[PDB]
Amino acid sequence: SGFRKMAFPSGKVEGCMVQVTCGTTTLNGLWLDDVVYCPRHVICTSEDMLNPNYEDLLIRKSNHNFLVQAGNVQLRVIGHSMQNCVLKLKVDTANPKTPKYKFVRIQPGQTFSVLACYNGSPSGVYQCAMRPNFTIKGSFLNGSCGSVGFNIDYDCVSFCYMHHMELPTGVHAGTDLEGNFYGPFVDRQTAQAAGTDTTITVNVLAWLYAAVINGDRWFLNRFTTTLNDFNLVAMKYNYEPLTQDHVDILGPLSAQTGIAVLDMCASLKELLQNGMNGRTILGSALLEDEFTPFDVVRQCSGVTF
Amino acid sequence: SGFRKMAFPSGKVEGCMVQVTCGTTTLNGLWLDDVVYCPRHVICTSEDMLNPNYEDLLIRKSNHNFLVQAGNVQLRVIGHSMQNCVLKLKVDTANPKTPKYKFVRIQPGQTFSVLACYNGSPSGVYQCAMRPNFTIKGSFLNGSCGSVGFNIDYDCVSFCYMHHMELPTGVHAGTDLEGNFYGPFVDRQTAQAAGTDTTITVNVLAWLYAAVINGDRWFLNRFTTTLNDFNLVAMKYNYEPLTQDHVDILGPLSAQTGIAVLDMCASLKELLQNGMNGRTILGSALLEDEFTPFDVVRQCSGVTF
Numbered sequence: 238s239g240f241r242k243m244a245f246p247s248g249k250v251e252g253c254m255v256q257v258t259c260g261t262t263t264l265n266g267l268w269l270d271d272v273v274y275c276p277r278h279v280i281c282t283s284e285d286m287l288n289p290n291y292e293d294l295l296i297r298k299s300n301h302n303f304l305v306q307a308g309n310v311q312l313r314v315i316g317h318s319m320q321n322c323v324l325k326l327k328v329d330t331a332n333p334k335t336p337k338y339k340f341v342r343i344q345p346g347q348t349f350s351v352l353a354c355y356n357g358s359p360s361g362v363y364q365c366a367m368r369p370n371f372t373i374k375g376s377f378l379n380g381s382c383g384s385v386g387f388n389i390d391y392d393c394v395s396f397c398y399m400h401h402m403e404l405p406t407g408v409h410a411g412t413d414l415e416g417n418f419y420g421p422f423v424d425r426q427t428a429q430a431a432g433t434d435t436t437i438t439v440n441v442l443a444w445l446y447a448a449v450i451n452g453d454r455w456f457l458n459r460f461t462t463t464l465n466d467f468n469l470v471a472m473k474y475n476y477e478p479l480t481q482d483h484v485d486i487l488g489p490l491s492a493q494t495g496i497a498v499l500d501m502c503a504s505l506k507e508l509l510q511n512g513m514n515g516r517t518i519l520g521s522a523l524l525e526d527e528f529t530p531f532d533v534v535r536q537c538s539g540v541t542f
Numbered sequence: 543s544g545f546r547k548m549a550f551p552s553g554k555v556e557g558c559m560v561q562v563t564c565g566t567t568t569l570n571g572l573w574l575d576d577v578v579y580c581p582r583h584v585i586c587t588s589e590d591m592l593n594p595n596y597e598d599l600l601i602r603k604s605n606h607n608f609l610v611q612a613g614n615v616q617l618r619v620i621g622h623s624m625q626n627c628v629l630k631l632k633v634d635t636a637n638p639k640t641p642k643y644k645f646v647r648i649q650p651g652q653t654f655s656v657l658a659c660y661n662g663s664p665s666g667v668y669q670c671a672m673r674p675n676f677t678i679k680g681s682f683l684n685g686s687c688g689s690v691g692f693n694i695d696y697d698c699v700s701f702c703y704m705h706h707m708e709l710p711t712g713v714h715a716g717t718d719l720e721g722n723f724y725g726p727f728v729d730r731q732t733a734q735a736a737g738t739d740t741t742i743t744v745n746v747l748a749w750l751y752a753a754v755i756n757g758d759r760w761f762l763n764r765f766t767t768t769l770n771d772f773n774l775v776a777m778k779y780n781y782e783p784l785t786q787d788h789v790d791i792l793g794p795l796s797a798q799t800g801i802a803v804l805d806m807c808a809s810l811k812e813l814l815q816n817g818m819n820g821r822t823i824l825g826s827a828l829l830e831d832e833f834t835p836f837d838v839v840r841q842c843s844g845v846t847f
């Protein structure tokens with residue numbers, strides 16, 4: 238028992254990380270098979286950053302200008318292409334450490350692990366969620382660009398995120414591995430509206446179920462509610478609307494604990510309206526929304542990779 | 543910017559994990575060079591668990607009774623020895639994936655990453671602290687025994703923890719890699735007092751500095767205090783006493799931010815006496831004590847391995 242904000246084991250991703258340098262700028266790349274993926278802004282300079290003309294900047298570059306290093310081994314670049322906001326550098330060697338992998342574009346509210354890297358070397362790993370407004374609340378310093386987010390299912394790494402940008406608000410933005418930003422963002426050093434965020438309701442409910450499974454039980458009450466009534470409360474507190482698809486994905490947790498989903502919604506309603514009265518749930522004094530129902534079942538059942 | 547509960551990249555430890563089976567019981571072992579380390583209670587049965595006679599149980603076992611499997615490769619056991627609460631199984635093959643490593647016995651209040659495993663396969667990685675009372679608040683299911691905690695410095699893994707036991711209170715206990723428990727605990731299925739825990743004061747102060755560096759600033763006040771006055775408050779709220787050695791290890795954070803350690807203590811004093819008035823610091827509504835001053839500097843400076 239016990240419940241922690243657990244990340245996927247990072248070893249399979251660590252073996253894919255490389256350093257990419259283009260002129261003065263160094264960032265991280267992801268070496269899968271014979272292709273290295275990295276953010277296109279490796280080709281910018283500081284005069285470029287307010288609104289880079291990436292097509293014009295890239296036309297000035299040749300294969301031999303992209304320096305790619307994997308530990309101490311230098312990779313030979315035999316082609317380069319810009320796809321959306323990522324650069325794809327073809328190399329003459331397939332990565333011997335390539336795992337089974339997929340590229341996935343995740344949905345807001347889903348979670349993944351980030352392997353933060355600098356100069357192609359791993360620094361740390363943590364779990365986070367894609368906010369409803371498509372930002373992530375990460376831990377990224379200058380030079381972390383090209384660090385990736387991922388999930389693992391059995392032996393397969395699903396890469397879902399590559400880091401590109403810290404907005405002036407201090408939150409983070411990035412792309413899928415085809416280089417398409419999540420959210421309205423562009424790779425320019427500018428203030429960019431993120432727009433209204435909300436709390437991921439289905440994840441809070443999943444975490445309340447996690448709490449019950451682990452014996453934090455004090456917030457269970459004698460009440461129930463309806464999906465309609467609950468959603469009027471969710472709106473008031475800037476929670477995502479709960480749908481029947483969410484109720485369905487909470488089914489396994491409802492079955493395990495015996496607590497109907499709408500009864501758990503009534504506990505959440507009371508916590509939103511009354512607060513946590515100085516108490517804690519699973520070591521937290523706020524309502525946690527970075528565990529999905531799948532996360533809770535995986536952690537509570539010991540699934541391995 | 544941003545601040546997360548970050549774990550070390552787990553790849554170097556993943557390559558050391560094996561499954562050990564002795565009779566009916568399977569747990570995890572750590573394969574370093576030509577030795578596999580695992581909890582001695584792999585040799586027990588359920589009739590054994592209230593007070594196993596480990597010496598008598600082990601005398602019934604021979605090398606060929608310890609089944610050790612690394613992925614699909616079976617290891618040949620050529621010797622076995624009990625050291626404190628760990629078994630050391632000599633194998634005829636050195637692990638080709640052995641990292642540079644050390645065994646360390648950590649001090650209460652220090653932090654480390656745990657790689658939770660089942661059947662020799664990694665499930666997840668998370669960061670935690672050794673509580674002042676030598677328990678850890680982990681996430682461990684049955685079969686996670688033999689999972690290890692560790693830190694990494696440059697290319698060297700310092701193994702500090704092997705998981706053995708969940709106390710009936712739901713908190714966790716384990717050993718260093720010489721098999722000595724942290725705390726008063728024994729490997730018996732019994733209620734065992736853990737005794738009074740406290741909050742790790744130097745870590746809370748480190749995290750308040752992390753907060754300022756990241757721009758959460760609202761708890762800074764116009765006050766200062768003395769070490770004596772602060773420790774009278776710490777005692778009242780079951781915080782560890784602050785010593786000058788702690789003030790010294792906070793020096794780099796004090797220098798970075800310009801906030802004297804005793805001024806930050808006065809902010810902490812006010813938060814202990816008044817609470818956080820419905821506000822948050824770094825995404826938390828309580829005072830966080832699982833980051834050491836070294837953790838904060840590492841994360842804020844991008845140190846890699």
Ligand SMILES: C=C1CCN(C(=O)Cn2nnc3ccccc32)CC1
Nearest residue numbers: 278377378379401402403424425426
């Ligand atoms: C053209 C752009 C937009 C601006 N930009 C970034 O913000 C890069 N970045 N990413 N995370 C960071 C964390 C700290 C400092 C900088 C960071 C570079 C690419």
Ligand SMILES: C=C1CCN(C(=O)Cn2nnc3ccccc32)CC1
Nearest residue numbers: 583682683684706707708729730731
């Ligand atoms: C003789 C003993 C003492 C009792 N014991 C354990 O508690 C093993 N254990 N460790 N973490 C666990 C989490 C869930 C269930 C069991 C767990 C086995 C060794």
